């Protein structure tokens, strides 16, 4: 819902590890949230978006890499017809922890 | 937050560029890997670390256990531990990939 979520290497990734593509549907926004304990590593694959982490908003283009440490708030705004697609890795992942602002 | 590649580590057959050093949790690491033109990375296995590859640019015969893919941009891979991998760069282009290491408690790398 809101953005797609395409897990890879399911059951193959060590304890607390996780990897997946996500696809932020076009001209949609992902709302302010944070993770209690998990890290997000992004590699921006295609499209363009506004990406906030803590106190900084980036104009995320492909080939950018981002880190979201925990208790750090993030959002994306896609203002493009093309979907925003990113490679995600989650570190110290204890399952679902998204506290949604 | 954003990745600024300002640190190069040179291993001759290639170069490794770490990312977010100190920022990542224990057992984690992330880095770009540049396999310099016409070069190969020789057969090698990792004690326990896992290596997730996202292939950024170029083509290089990539070999994980028994399957040699031709790693193009957009491919994703995993090299579970105790798995023999290597890379032959074919082009006059760097073969570049975003790597994360999982279960990395320092250099578990070993080479055949
Ligand atoms: Zn997110
Ligand atoms: Zn390796
Ligand atoms: Zn694969």
Author numbering:
A (entry chain G): 12 to 112
B (entry chain A): 1 to 112
Provide the authors' own sentences about this structure as they appear in the paper:
To investigate protein HHP adaptation, Elastic Incoherent Neutron Scattering (EINS) and Quasi-Elastic Neutron Scattering (QENS) have been employed to study the dynamics of two orthologous proteins from T. barophilus (Tba) and T. kodakarensis (Tko), which only differ by their optimal growth pressure. X-ray crystallography was performed to obtain the structures of the proteins. Both present very similar features: their structure is dominated by β-sheet contributions with turns and disordered regions connecting them, forming a jelly-roll barrel structure, and both present a dimeric quaternary structure. The active site is located in a pocket inside the barrel and is conserved between the two proteins (His44, His46, Glu51 and His85). The two orthologs differ at 16 positions, and most of the substitutions are located at the protein–water interface and involve mainly polar and charged residues, with the notable exceptions of I35V, located in the hydrophobic core of the protein, and I100V, located at the monomer–monomer interface.
Interestingly, the catalytic metal ion coordinated by these four residues is found to be magnesium in Tba PMI and zinc in Tko PMI; however, the structure’s resolution does not allow for making a definitive assignment, as the Van der Waals radius of both ions is smaller than the resolution. Tko PMI crystals were obtained after one week from condition E8 of the Structure screen 1 + 2 kit (Molecular Dimensions), containing 0.2 M ammonium phosphate monobasic, 0.1 M Tris pH 8.5, and 50% v/v MPD. Tba PMI crystals belong to the I222 space group and contain one molecule in the asymmetric unit, while Tko PMI crystals belong to the P31 space group and contain eight molecules in the asymmetric unit. After model building using Coot and Refine from the Phenix package (Tba PMI) or REFMAC5 (Tko PMI), the final structures exhibited an R(%)/R(%)free of 0.18/0.20 at 1.7 Å (Tba PMI) and 0.23/0.29 at 2.2 Å (Tko PMI). Hence, our data indicate that the extent of compression of the protein hydrophobic core is larger in Tko PMI than in Tba PMI, presumably due to the presence of bigger cavities in the former. The appearance of VFT behaviour on such a fast time-scale is intriguing, and it shows that side-chain relaxations are strongly coupled to hydration water dynamics in Tko PMI. It appears that Tko PMI’s dynamics are dominated by cooperative motions and that high pressure can destabilize them, as highlighted by the increase in fragility (i.e., decreasing D) with increasing pressure, while Tba PMI’s dynamics are dominated by pressure-insensitive activated processes. On the other hand, the temperature dependence of Tko PMI appears to be stronger, and a sizeable increase in the confinement radius is detected with increasing pressure.
